[PDB]
Amino acid sequence: KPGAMYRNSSKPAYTRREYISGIPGKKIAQFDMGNNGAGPTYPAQVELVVEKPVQIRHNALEAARVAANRYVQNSGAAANYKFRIRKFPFHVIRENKDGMRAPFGKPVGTAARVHGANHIFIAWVNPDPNVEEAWRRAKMKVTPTINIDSSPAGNA
Amino acid sequence: FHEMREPRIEKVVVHMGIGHANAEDILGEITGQMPVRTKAKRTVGEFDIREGDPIGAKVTLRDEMAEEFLQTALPLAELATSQFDDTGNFSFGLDVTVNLVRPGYRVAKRDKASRSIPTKHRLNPADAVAFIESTYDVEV
Amino acid sequence: PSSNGPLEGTRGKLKNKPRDRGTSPPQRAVEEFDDGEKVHLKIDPSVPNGRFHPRFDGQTGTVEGKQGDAYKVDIVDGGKEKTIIVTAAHLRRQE
Amino acid sequence: MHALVQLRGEVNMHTDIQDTLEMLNIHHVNHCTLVPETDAYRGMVAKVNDFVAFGEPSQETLETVLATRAEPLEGDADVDDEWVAEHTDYDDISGLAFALLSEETTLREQGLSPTLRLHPPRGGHDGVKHPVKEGGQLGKHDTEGIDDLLEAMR
Amino acid sequence: ATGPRYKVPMRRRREARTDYHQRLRLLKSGKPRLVARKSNKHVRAQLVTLGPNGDDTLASAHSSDLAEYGWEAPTGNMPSAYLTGLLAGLRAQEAGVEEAVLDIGLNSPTPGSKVFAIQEGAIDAGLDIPHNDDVLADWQRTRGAHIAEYDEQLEEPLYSGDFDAADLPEHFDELRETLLDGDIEL
RNA sequence: CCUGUCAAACUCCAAACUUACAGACGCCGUUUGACGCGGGGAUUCCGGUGCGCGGGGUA
RNA sequence: AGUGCAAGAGCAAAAGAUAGCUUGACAGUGUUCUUCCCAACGAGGAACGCUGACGCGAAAGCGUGGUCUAGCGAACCAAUU
RNA sequence: UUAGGCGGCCACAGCGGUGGGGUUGCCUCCCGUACCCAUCCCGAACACGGAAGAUAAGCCCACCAGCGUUCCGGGGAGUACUGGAGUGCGCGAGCCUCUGGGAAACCCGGUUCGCCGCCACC
RNA sequence: GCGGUCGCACCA
Numbered sequence A: 001k002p003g004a005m006y007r008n009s010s011k012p013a014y015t016r017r018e019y020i021s022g023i024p025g026k027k028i029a030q031f032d033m034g035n036n037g038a039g040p041t042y043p044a045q046v047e048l049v050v051e052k053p054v055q056i057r058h059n060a061l062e063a064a065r066v067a068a069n070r071y072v073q074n075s076g077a078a079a080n081y082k083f084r085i086r087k088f089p090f091h092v093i094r095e096n097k098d099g100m101r102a103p104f105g106k107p108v109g110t111a112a113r114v115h116g117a118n119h120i121f122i123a124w125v126n127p128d129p130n131v132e133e134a135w136r137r138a139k140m141k142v143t144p145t146i147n148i149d150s151s152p153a154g155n156a
Numbered sequence B: 001f002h003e004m005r006e007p008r009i010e011k012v013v014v015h016m017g018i019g020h021a022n023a024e025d026i027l028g029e030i031t032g033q034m035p036v037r038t039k040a041k042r043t044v045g046e047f048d049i050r051e052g053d054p055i056g057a058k059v060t061l062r063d064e065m066a067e068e069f070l071q072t073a074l075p076l077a078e079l080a081t082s083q084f085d086d087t088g089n090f091s092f093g094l095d096v097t098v099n100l101v102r103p104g105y106r107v108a109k110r111d112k113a114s115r116s117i118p119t120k121h122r123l124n125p126a127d128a129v130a131f132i133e134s135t136y137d138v139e140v
Numbered sequence C: 001p002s003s004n005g006p007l008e009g010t011r012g013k014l015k016n017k018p019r020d021r022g023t024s025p026p027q028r029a030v031e032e033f034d035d036g037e038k039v040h041l042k043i044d045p046s047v048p049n050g051r052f053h054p055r056f057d058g059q060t061g062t063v064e065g066k067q068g069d070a071y072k073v074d075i076v077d078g079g080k081e082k083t084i085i086v087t088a089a090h091l092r093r094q095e
Numbered sequence D: 001m002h003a004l005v006q007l008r009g010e011v012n013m014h015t016d017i018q019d020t021l022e023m024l025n026i027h028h029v030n031h032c033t034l035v036p037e038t039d040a041y042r043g044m045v046a047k048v049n050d051f052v053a054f055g056e057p058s059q060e061t062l063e064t065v066l067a068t069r070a071e072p073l074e075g076d077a078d079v080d081d082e083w084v085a086e087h088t089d090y091d092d093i094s095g096l097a098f099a100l101l102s103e104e105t106t107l108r109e110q111g112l113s114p115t116l117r118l119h120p121p122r123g124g125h126d127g128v129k130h131p132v133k134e135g136g137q138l139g140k141h142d143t144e145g146i147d148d149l150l151e152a153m154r
Numbered sequence E: 001a002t003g004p005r006y007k008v009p010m011r012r013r014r015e016a017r018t019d020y021h022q023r024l025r026l027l028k029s030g031k032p033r034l035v036a037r038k039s040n041k042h043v044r045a046q047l048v049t050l051g052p053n054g055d056d057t058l059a060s061a062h063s064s065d066l067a068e069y070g071w072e073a074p075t076g077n078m079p080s081a082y083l084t085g086l087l088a089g090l091r092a093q094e095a096g097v098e099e100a101v102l103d104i105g106l107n108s109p110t111p112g113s114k115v116f117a118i119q120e121g122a123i124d125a126g127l128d129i130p131h132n133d134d135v136l137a138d139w140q141r142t143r144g145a146h147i148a149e150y151d152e153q154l155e156e157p158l159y160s161g162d163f164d165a166a167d168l169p170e171h172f173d174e175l176r177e178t179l180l181d182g183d184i185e186l
Numbered sequence F: 001c002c003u004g005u006c007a008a009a010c011u012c013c014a015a016a017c018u019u020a021c022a023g024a025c026g027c028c029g030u031u032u033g034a035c036g037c038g039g040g041g042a043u044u045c046c047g048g049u050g051c052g053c054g055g056g057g058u059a
Numbered sequence G: 001a002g003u004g005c006a007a008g009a010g011c012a013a014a015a016g017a018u019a020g021c022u023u024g025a026c027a028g029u030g031u032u033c034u035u036c037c038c039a040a041c042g043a044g045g046a047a048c049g050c051u052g053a054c055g056c057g058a059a060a061g062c063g064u065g066g067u068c069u070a071g072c073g074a075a076c077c078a079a080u081u
Numbered sequence H: 001u002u003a004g005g006c007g008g009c010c011a012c013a014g015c016g017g018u019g020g021g022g023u024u025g026c027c028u029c030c031c032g033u034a035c036c037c038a039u040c041c042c043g044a045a046c047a048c049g050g051a052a053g054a055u056a057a058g059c060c061c062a063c064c065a066g067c068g069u070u071c072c073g074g075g076g077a078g079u080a081c082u083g084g085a086g087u088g089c090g091c092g093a094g095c096c097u098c099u100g101g102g103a104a105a106c107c108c109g110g111u112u113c114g115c116c117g118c119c120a121c122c
Numbered sequence I: 001g002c003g004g005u006c007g008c009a010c011c012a
């Protein structure tokens, strides 16, 4: 199914698992990538900033992250960098799959609500922005237009 | 300062935690005053489902009744250390517990303006061993 | 509303903030008012008795006599005149 | 003391806003009233802020408008210096104007209609879809700004 | 103490001095309270009314200012209590106070107790108070007879020096007698 | 200890705002009698749209 | 924690626990709110009184069933006091 | 208030800690069980009777901010949100301007280790 | 309500 059906934040926040059952598991594999043994002790720090509030299905999160990290292997399976996706798909999403009679849908998935300007991804790298490329590929698989922002790095 | 800081025995509780008694009799003679029933709480597998139910007795002795008892109890015990309270108490044995404290304890046991005893004025394990050990026997 | 009992939707108004929790001070449960006095109605979550229908929480009526120890306060619900039987525990002097 | 002029019609305007203008004696478009600067009055004008033009006029301007558009509580009578002198505490329009501006009295107190029924602005106003700071004609004005409007509607 | 949500008891409940549940019931009568309080050595009796910023004591009597009338005996006993009640009761009457309810604070309603003796006194002073006669002591014990007889089992004076060796429930009468007419502060 | 996130059926907090009563100004009423009381006569109980706030629904 | 049972709320020298005693889960009659916001409408419900008779308590006092919001039923007819 | 009793507000008063104080006004701890009364067992408590001793508890007095709380300055922030208005922008979601209001977290620095009432009293 | 889960009876 299309993002068209769930990308807007027009519905109430629906996240109380105590009243919702049958919620599908998340497809997101990991949130911490790279050298998670080490702490952000890197010279450069780039972030992927979403430019519009939207909902991002765990589907797009996984594809976005995979496409970015799977690429960050321009640095090697045990390369020196750490990648972080800070958002989690808390918002439960339904589908009315009778016509409009008793239409409250049944749980079909989850999504993460991101507000325009938040950073969804943050990578930590030594002067070697291959990560800038890992993100051109990441914001390729999420609904919004995005800003690739660099923070600690006056090494231009 | 002292005199009102020096330990003293406040009650010695001798209780037989049976599981259902005829045992009171011996407690009465071993101590010198009537024993009290021991009802239990919660229903459990040891065929002890009855809430209100005699399952042992105890006897709280105070003053001479407590000494005159310890003057035979203690001798029947050896242990010491580790087996002492953080408040200067100790239980050995049929159980025989000895509650120890200093002079102004009533402040925490009365009805009016009661108050909890300050940690400083509390009795330490050590200050306890001393008092008792200094009364017909040895520590550890 | 999914039901129509008196306490429907009263979760907030009949609950105390955690710190105001517990038996309330007796001073205000014994306050005495005079006929003609303006009093603000506000149920005290801690005091079970002497209450009035939650809908009137916030009203400001006029004491006009009493019934037993409870007071009879006159208020105006929308445009309708009503008389409320309430104890001091739930009243406060206006101004 | 501020000069109030309704620049937007009643159709579709909130009722509680319309009632406010009405309490300020304005019941038609282009009608103007003089209002003391008090807390109570200030709140009213703020509520009516989007359908009116207001500001503190200059002694001269007030005088021109008073002369040109002031009326007796009843009747056609022109309110000129003589009228003013033979009917009010002051001796001429200027004296009345000053008193109004210094909020010492009111049009009613002096037997005058609380409303100055102005004429449409000669040359047209700046628009009723934007405030002054945006080039429109709504909201608070400059003494110079109010004067221009009042004068064009003299 | 632990956090923002923590509930700290009213001060007088922390101090374990006021029972607020009983207080409310007491105040229900709308009458003045006859506050009966004791100390290891003394006995106090106050007639308290309700006030905007706290209680107002309109009349009181302490077992100590009993001597001021000729008391030459200990002040932490039954005869003492009664008299302090009667003394406060009289001052009470003088103040225009006619009735009151017995507030025994955190004490226990034990029959023949000193608080009830205090109550007996106040009643005899003229104060109208809700009571129950057979919860009070039998006059003789109020007089202090139980103590005189206790000194009969002498061998050693019950009173260290003090006054008398065999004590005096008679001293009691002389005093009650005194309080029942004229004299200052009454 | 450090570090990454949430809540229509969470809340240590907390608006704008809505609301009871009172005073003040405004406006209104005392011949145009208001506020209110009693009585006669209805029509009406298929609604719609814009905007703000919504709940459901891919729409 | 507990407080019979949904959910939300109340409660600690207690509204919870233990013990003891008691039968107010009483008769009669009302005021008021609710049912039905505003704003008319029955049964039902509740709050608060009074009259009478009682229980407990030293007493103030508490007890108009269960801490609060569900657990209810017209006329005709029958049986019953 | 050289120590008390009854309170009001009910943490600005809580939690924790330091120092000081009593031949007596005093409060306590304390000493003691013939009585009133009392422990489903214990004069522990409750109740009664009393002063040999003590200021070590409590309590009263002076103080400490580490935790919790109250209020204030500066920063966050006139940000977030928002009542009124717009032929302002945007495919749209949504945003912006004018007008009237206006936060929370958190950081840094102060405040807070109760205030007040009646009575009694070297 | 009456009769052995069933059958009969029954205008609140």
Ligand SMILES: [Cl-]
Residues within 6 Å of the ligand: C051, C052, C053, C056, C084, C085, G033
């Ligand atoms: Cl009501």
Ligand SMILES: [Cl-]
Residues within 6 Å of the ligand: B112, E036, E037, E038, E039, E105, E106, E107
């Ligand atoms: Cl006392």
Ligand SMILES: [Mg+2]
Residues within 6 Å of the ligand: C012
């Ligand atoms: Mg709500």
Ligand SMILES: [Mg+2]
Residues within 6 Å of the ligand: D071, D072, D073, D074, D075, D113
């Ligand atoms: Mg005219």
Ligand SMILES: [Mg+2]
Residues within 6 Å of the ligand: D123
């Ligand atoms: Mg033209």
Ligand SMILES: [Mg+2]
Residues within 6 Å of the ligand: D126, D127, D128
């Ligand atoms: Mg134009």
Ligand SMILES: [Mg+2]
Residues within 6 Å of the ligand: F018
């Ligand atoms: Mg609302």
Ligand SMILES: [Mg+2]
Residues within 6 Å of the ligand: none
């Ligand atoms: Mg009840």
Ligand SMILES: [Mg+2]
Residues within 6 Å of the ligand: G079, G080
């Ligand atoms: Mg029948």
Ligand SMILES: [Mg+2]
Residues within 6 Å of the ligand: none
């Ligand atoms: Mg000391």
Ligand SMILES: [Mg+2]
Residues within 6 Å of the ligand: I012
């Ligand atoms: Mg029928």
Ligand code: NA
Residues within 6 Å of the ligand: A098, A101
């Ligand atoms: Na169907």
Ligand code: NA
Residues within 6 Å of the ligand: A139, A140, A141, A142, A143, A144, A145, A146
């Ligand atoms: Na995109």
Ligand code: NA
Residues within 6 Å of the ligand: C016, C020, C021, C022, C023, C024, C025, C046
């Ligand atoms: Na409370």
Ligand code: NA
Residues within 6 Å of the ligand: none
């Ligand atoms: Na009814």
Ligand code: NA
Residues within 6 Å of the ligand: B037, H040
């Ligand atoms: Na038993």
